[PDB]
Design an enzyme around this catalytic site. Structure first.
Site, short mmCIF file in Angstrom:
data_model
loop_
_atom_site.label_atom_id
_atom_site.label_comp_id
_atom_site.label_asym_id
_atom_site.label_seq_id
_atom_site.Cartn_x
_atom_site.Cartn_y
_atom_site.Cartn_z
N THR A 193 5.72 -2.83 4.04
CA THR A 193 5.19 -2.77 2.66
C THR A 193 6.23 -2.91 1.55
OG1 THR A 193 3.29 -1.57 3.45
CG2 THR A 193 3.78 -1.35 1.12
N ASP A 202 -4.76 -1.93 4.69
CA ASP A 202 -3.68 -1.42 5.54
C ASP A 202 -3.99 0.00 6.09
OD1 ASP A 202 -0.59 -1.50 6.29
OD2 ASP A 202 -0.94 0.43 5.34
N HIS A 210 1.50 -8.35 3.92
CA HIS A 210 1.74 -8.58 5.37
C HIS A 210 0.38 -8.41 6.05
CE1 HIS A 210 1.28 -4.31 5.81
NE2 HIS A 210 2.30 -4.13 5.00
#
Ligand SMILES: *[C@@H]1O[C@H](CO)[C@@H](O[C@@H]2O[C@H](CO)[C@@H](O[C@@H]3O[C@H](CO[C@H]4O[C@H](CO)[C@@H](O)[C@H](O[C@H]5O[C@H](CO)[C@@H](O)[C@H](O)[C@@H]5O[C@H]5O[C@H](CO)[C@@H](O)[C@H](O)[C@@H]5O)[C@@H]4O)[C@@H](O)[C@H](O[C@H]4O[C@H](CO)[C@@H](O)[C@H](O)[C@@H]4O[C@H]4O[C@H](CO)[C@@H](O)[C@H](O)[C@@H]4O)[C@@H]3O)[C@H](O)[C@H]2NC(C)=O)[C@H](O)[C@H]1NC(C)=O
Ligand SMILES: Cn1c(=O)[nH]c2ccc(C(=O)N3C[C@H]4CCN(C(=O)c5cc(OCC6CCOCC6)nc(C6CC6)c5)CC[C@H]4C3)cc21
Ligand SMILES: [Ca+2]
Ligand SMILES: [Ca+2]
Ligand SMILES: [Cl-]
Ligand SMILES: [K+]
Ligand code: NA
Ligand SMILES: [Zn+2]
Length: 802
Positions: free
Chosen positions: A159, A261, A309
Site C-alpha cells: 500500500t 483490500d 495493487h
C-alpha cells in the site's frame, strides 16, 4: 499536547491545517487526536441518513441533518447527492447515455477542469470484468472514458509504496517508502503502519503531487482521510469544497477507499463476501457522479479511478519458515510475509555472515517457494536496491506464499485468505486505471502501463511542471484528448569516429591467435564502409548521451559502437531474417581472436589477460553462429566483438545466441537485435562512470560488466519482415546479471533448454531501463511519432498469460 479547548464552528474540514496546541478541524485531525471537542457534533453529522426521500423534499433546512433536501441546498452546495433525482425528476448519472466530452463544460470562474483522484486499495485488475454486473457506475466510467486492461504497480506491491509512487512518479528506492515496514539505519528509527513515526517528514522523499501543485499556485484538497470518517461524508466534503469561491476552491482532490483490500485480506480476492464491498465502492462512485451532475460539474471534472495493487490467495499453511533452513535463526531480523528482508539482529555480532545465510537459503527443498538474493542481483526491472532502508538480503516469494522466521510468528499474531506484496509482474498484483473527463479520450482502450507514469499525467491535467521523476513524460500522451506534453529527443553528446584501416597485424601483441580475387575484395571493403548498414541498423544508431570516446565499426553482418574507454562495444546491432541459418563455429576457429586493424593495440582487449584470469572467459556480442557466409564469420572473431564472460554465464549466453535468436526470428518474421554490456556496480540503475568499476579482467584494464542486455525488435504486424516494416514495432528486452555461478537457477545442472529461457524471462526489461543503465538513446530514426516510441520504450514483456 493539544489544547483541544477551541471550536470547529464554521471551520469543518478546513483546508489549511492549524498549528498545535490550537485544535484542528481538518479531515486528518482524528489520526492525531487533535480535533476540537465539537468536531463530531458539527463536522460528522449523520442525522437522517445519506439520501433524500419524497417527503424530505423542499423541507425547511435543519442544520443537524447529514445532508439537505431544502430548496437552498444547491446554492449552499450541501444537498444529498440524490436530491435532484428524488425532488426534481432528474435521472442518476449512471442512467444517462454517454456523450463525448469534447471540451470542459464548467461553471464561470473555473480556471481549469478540476481533477478528482479516486483510489481503491487492493482493487485487482480483473475485478473490472469479474465484478462488472455489480459495478454499473465504474463500468460507465470505464467504457465511456479511457481505460487500460490493467496497470502495473511497483514492487513491493504494498500500500504505502504504491500510493507514494502514485503521488510522486518515483520508484520506492528513490521516494524512500520501500515497504509498509522499514528500518532506517542512519536515523536509527523504524516505520510501521501502526503508530507515530510514519508521520515524521524525513521518511517521505521526492515531491508529491499536493506539494507540486501548491508550489506552482494550484490549490490542493487535503488527500488524506481519517479512517473513521464515512465514505459518504468524504464525498459530501469534496462536493462542498467544489462549491467554494473561485479564490479558495481546490483544483485537485483525492478520495481513498480502504476497500476492497480490507475485505480481500479476510476472504481472498474472489471470496463470495467480496461482492458487497464492490457494490459499496460502486455506490460511492455513483454518489460522486450524481453530486457532480447536481453542481453541473459532471462534464467539467477529470476523474481518475486507480488502484494501488491487486490481491492474491494466500493462507497460513502456505508459509515457509526460515528456521527450517537456518540453524542460527535468532541472530537475524526478518521483515516477513509476501517478501523477505533479512538483516543482523545485532550489528555487534561480528560472526553474522550474509554469504552463508544466502547459501543456507539456496535451492534447499525441491519445491522451495522463495528465492534469496543479494539486493543488487534482483531483476533490474524491480528497481529495488538503491536505498539504505532496503536490506542487503532479500527474498522474492512465490505468489500465494508467505515467508516467516519461526512457526511461533504465524500462530501468535487461519486469520487471512488474501495478501499482496509479490513481484510486480504477477497477474494477481495488477490493478486498474480509468480516466474520465474532457481531457481524457472518449471510449478508448490503451495498453497496460506502469503506475510510475501517472504523476506526469496528473501534472499535465493540472498544467503543472512535474518534479524530476521515473515516468517517461509523453509515453502516456495517447490517453489524452489535449494537454499532451511534446518532448524532444535528447541531444547526442558524443559523436563517434569512423576509423579506417590504420594498424598492421604485427603491431598487436595480445597473445591472441587465429588460424585464418578482385570481385569480392571491393565487396569486403564496401561492407567495412557500411553497405549493409541499412539492413543491420534499422532504427538509426543509438545516441550516446554522455561525453566519451567511441568508434562506429561496420561489418557485413553487424554494426557496433566500440568504446575506447571500456575496450568493448557499448552496443552491437544486427538483423536476423526468418530465412537465416545457424551454422556452427568451425574447429580451425575455436579459440580464434583476431586483431581489428581499425583499432589501436592500446584500445584493444588482449587474450593473455583471459588466459591469466582463471575465473573469467570471453564471449561475443555478434554471435558467430549467425554469420551470413563462412567469409563473414571471420568478422565475428574480431577482438572488438569480444566481451568478458564467466564460464557459468557463457552457458546462458551461448544458448540465447545459438538457439533463441533463431527461434525469435522464425516466430516474429525477422528480428533486429542490439546487445551490449551494462556496468552498474553501485546498483543505482544508472550507467557507471569508469571510476565506479569494481572488477577488471586479471591484470588488465578490461572492465567486467555486471549485466548484458539485448533489445529484440520486429514488426507488430508479423506478416511483414522486421527489415521491411511499415507501421508500429514490437519489442522485448532483457538485462541478464553477469554472474560467476548459476545459483539463481535451481535446475541449472540440467540442459540449457530447461532453465535458460525462464531466467531470461525473469530478467525481462523495458528499453527505458537499458537507456538509464547505458546512457544510450535508441530508436532515433523511425517513421513513428516520438510519443509512440516513448510508449514502446516503456513496454515490458511480462511472460504472464491472459
Ligand atoms: C528516478 O528519478 C529520480 C529523480 O530524478 C532519480 O533520482 C535522482 O538521481 C540523481 C542522480 O543520482 C540525484 O542527484 C544527486 O542529488 C544530490 C542532492 O540530493 C538532494 O537534493 C534532491 C533535490 O531536492 C533531493 O530529492 C534528494 O533526496 C534524496 O535524499 C533523501 C535521503 O537523504 C530522501 O528524502 C529522498 O528519498 C532522496 O533519496 C534518494 O536519492 C539519493 C541520491 O540523491 C539516494 O542515495 C537514496 O538512496 C535515495 O534513493 C537530496 O536530499 C547531489 O548531492 C548529487 O551530487 C553528487 O554527484 C554529482 C554528479 O553530478 C557531483 O556533481 C557532485 O559533486 C555530488 O558528489 C558529491 O557528493 C557525493 C555523495 O555524497 C560524494 O561522494 C562526492 O565526493 C561529492 O562531494 C546528485 O546530483 C537525485 O538526488 C535523485 N533524486 C531523487 C528524488 O531520488 C533516479 O536516479 C531515477 N531512477 C532511475 C533508475 O532512473
Ligand atoms: C495491513 N495492511 C495491508 O496489508 N494492506 C493495507 C491497506 C490499508 C491499511 C490501512 O488501514 N491504512 C490506514 C490509512 C488509510 C488512509 N490512506 C490514505 O489516506 C493515503 C492516501 C494517499 O493517496 C496518495 C494519492 C496520490 C495520487 O494518486 C492517488 C493516491 N497516500 C497516502 C500516503 C502515501 C502518502 C495515504 C492510506 C494509508 C493508510 C493505510 C493497512 C493495510
Ligand atoms: Ca493497498
Ligand atoms: Ca550505476
Ligand atoms: Cl514491507
Ligand atoms: K580465463
Ligand atoms: Na543452479
Ligand atoms: Zn492490504
Amino acid at each position: 499536547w493539544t489544547a483541544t479547548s477551541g471550536s470547529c464552528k464554521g471551520r469543518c474540514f478546513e483546508l489549511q491545517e492549524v498549528g498545535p496546541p490550537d485544535c484542528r478541524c481538518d479531515n486528518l485531525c482524528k489520526s492525531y487526536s487533535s480535533c476540537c471537542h465539537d468536531f463530531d457534533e458539527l463536522c460528522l453529522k449523520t442525522a437522517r441518513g445519506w439520501e433524500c426521500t419524497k417527503d424530505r423534499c423542499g423541507e425547511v433546512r435543519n442544520e443537524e441533518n447529514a445532508c439537505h433536501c431544502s430548496e437552498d441546498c444547491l446554492s449552499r452546495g450541501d444537498c444529498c447527492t440524490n436530491y435532484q433525482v428524488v425532488c426534481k425528476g432528474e435521472s442518476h448519472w449512471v442512467d444517462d447515455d454517454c456523450e463525448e466530452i469534447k471540451v470542459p463544460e464548467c461553471p464561470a470562474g473555473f480556471v481549469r477542469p478540476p481533477l478528482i483522484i479516486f483510489s481503491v486499495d487492493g482493487f485487482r485488475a480483473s475485478y473490472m470484468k469479474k465484478g462488472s454486473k455489480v459495478m454499473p457506475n465504474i463500468e460507465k466510467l470505464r467504457s465511456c472514458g479511457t481505460h487500460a486492461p490493467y496497470m502495473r504497480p511497483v514492487y513491493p506491491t504494498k500500500t504505502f509504496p504504491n500510493l507514494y509512487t502514485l503521488a510522486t512518479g518515483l520508484y520506492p528506492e528513490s521516494h524512500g517508502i520501500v515497504g509498509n515496514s522499514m528500518y532506517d539505519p542512519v536515523f536509527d528509527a523504524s516505520f510501521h503502519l501502526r503508530g507515530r513515526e510514519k508521520f515524521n517528514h524525513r521518511w517521505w522523499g521526492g515531491q508529491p503531487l499536493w506539494i507540486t501543485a501548491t508550489k506552482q499556485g494550484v490549490r490542493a484538497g487535503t488527500f488524506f482521510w481519517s479512517v473513521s470518517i464515512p465514505h459518504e461524508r468524504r464525498i459530501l466534503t469534496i462536493l462542498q469544497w467544489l462549491s467554494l469561491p473561485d479564490n479558495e476552491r481546490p483544483s485537485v482532490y483525492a478520495f481513498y477507499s480502504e476497500q476492497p483490500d480490507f475485505s480481500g485480506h479476510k476472504y481472498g480476492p474472489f471470496g463470495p463476501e467480496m461482492t458487497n464491498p464492490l457494490r459499496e465502492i460502486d455506490k460511492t462512485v455513483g454518489q460522486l457522479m450524481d453530486g457532480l451532475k447536481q453542481l453541473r460539474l459532471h462534464r467539467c471534472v477529470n476523474v481518475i479511478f486507480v488502484g494501488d495493487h491487486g490481491m492474491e490467495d494466500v493462507t497460513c499453511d502456505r508459509t515457509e519458515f526460515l528456521s527450517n533452513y537456518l540453524t542460527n535463526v535468532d541472530d537475524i531480523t526478518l521483515v516477513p510475509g509476501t517478501l523477505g528482508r533479512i538483516r543482523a539482529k545485532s550489528i555487534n555480532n561480528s560472526k553474522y555472515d550474509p554469504k552463508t545465510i544466502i547459501a543456507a537459503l539456496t535451492c534447499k527443498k525441491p519445491d522451495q517457494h522463495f528465492k534469496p538474493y543479494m539486493k543488487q542481483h534482483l531483476p533490474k526491472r524491480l528497481h529495488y536496491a538503491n536505498n539504505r532502508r532496503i536490506e542487503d538480503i532479500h527474498l522474492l516469494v512465490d505468489r500465494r506464499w508467505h515467508v516467516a522466521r519461526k512457526p511461533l510468528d504465524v500462530y501468535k499474531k487461519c486469520f487471512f485468505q488474501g495478501d499482496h506484496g509479490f513481484d510486480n509482474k504477477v497477474n494477481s498484483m495488477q490493478t486498474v486505471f480509468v480516466g474520465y473527463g474532457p481531457t481524457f479520450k472518449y471510449r478508448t482502450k490503451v495498453p497496460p502501463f506502469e503506475n510510475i507514469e501517472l504523476y506526469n499525467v496528473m501534472c499535465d491535467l493540472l498544467g503543472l511542471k512535474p518534479a524530476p521523476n521515473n515516468g517517461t513524460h509523453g509515453s502516456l500522451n495517447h490517453l489524452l484528448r489535449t494537454n499532451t506534453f511534446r518532448p524532444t529527443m535528447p541531444d547526442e553528446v558524443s559523436r563517434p569516429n569512423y576509423p579506417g584501416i590504420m594498424y598492421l597485424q604485427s603491431e598487436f601483441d595480445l597473445g591472441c591467435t587465429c588460424d585464418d580475387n578482385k570481385l569480392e575484395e571491393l565487396n569486403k571493403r564496401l561492407h567495412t564502409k557500411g553497405s549493409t548498414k541499412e539492413r543491420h541498423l534499422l532504427y538509426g544508431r543509438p545516441a550516446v548521451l554522455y561525453r566519451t570516446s567511441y568508434d562506429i565499426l561496420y561489418h557485413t553482418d553487424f554494426e557496433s559502437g566500440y568504446s575506447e574507454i571500456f575496450l568493448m562495444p557499448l552496443w552491437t546491432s544486427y538483423t536476423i531474417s526468418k530465412q537465416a541459418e545457424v551454422s556452427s563455429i568451425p574447429e580451425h576457429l575455436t579459440n580464434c581472436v583476431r586483431p581489428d586493424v581499425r583499432v589501436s593495440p592500446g584500445f584493444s582487449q588482449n587474450c593473455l589477460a583471459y588466459k591469466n584470469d582463471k575465473q573469467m572467459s570471453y564471449g561475443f556480442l555478434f554471435p558467430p553462429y549467425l554469420s551470413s557466409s563462412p567469409e563473414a564469420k571471420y568478422d565475428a572473431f574480431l577482438v572488438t566483438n569480444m566481451v568478458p564472460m564467466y564460464p557459468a554465464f557463457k552457458r546462458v549466453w551461448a544458448y540465447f545466441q545459438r538457439v533463441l535468436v533463431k527461434k525469435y526470428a522464425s516466430e516474429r518474421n525477422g528480428v533486429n537485435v542490439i546487445s551490449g554490456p551494462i556496468f552498474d556496480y553501485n546498483y543505482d540503475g544508472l550507467r557507471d562512470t569508469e571510476d565506479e568499476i569494481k572488477q577488471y579482467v586479471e591484470g588488465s584494464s578490461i572492465p567486467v560488466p555486471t549485466h548484458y542486455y539485448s533489445i529484440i525488435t520486429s514488426c507488430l504486424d508479423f506478416t511483414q519482415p522486421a527489415d521491411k516494416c511499415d507501421g508500429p514495432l514490437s519489442v522485448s528486452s532483457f538485462i541478464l546479471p553477469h554472474r560467476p555461478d548459476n545459483d539463481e537457477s535451481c535446475n541449472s545442472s540440467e540442459d540449457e533448454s530447461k532453465w535458460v529461457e525462464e531466467l531470461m524471462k525473469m530478467h525481462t526489461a523495458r528499453v527505458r531501463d537499458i537507456e538509464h543503465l547505458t546512457g544510450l538513446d535508441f530508436y532515433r530514426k523511425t517513421s513513428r511519432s516520438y510519443s509512440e516510441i516513448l510508449t514502446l520504450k516503456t513496454y515490458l514483456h511480462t511472460y504472464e498469460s491472459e
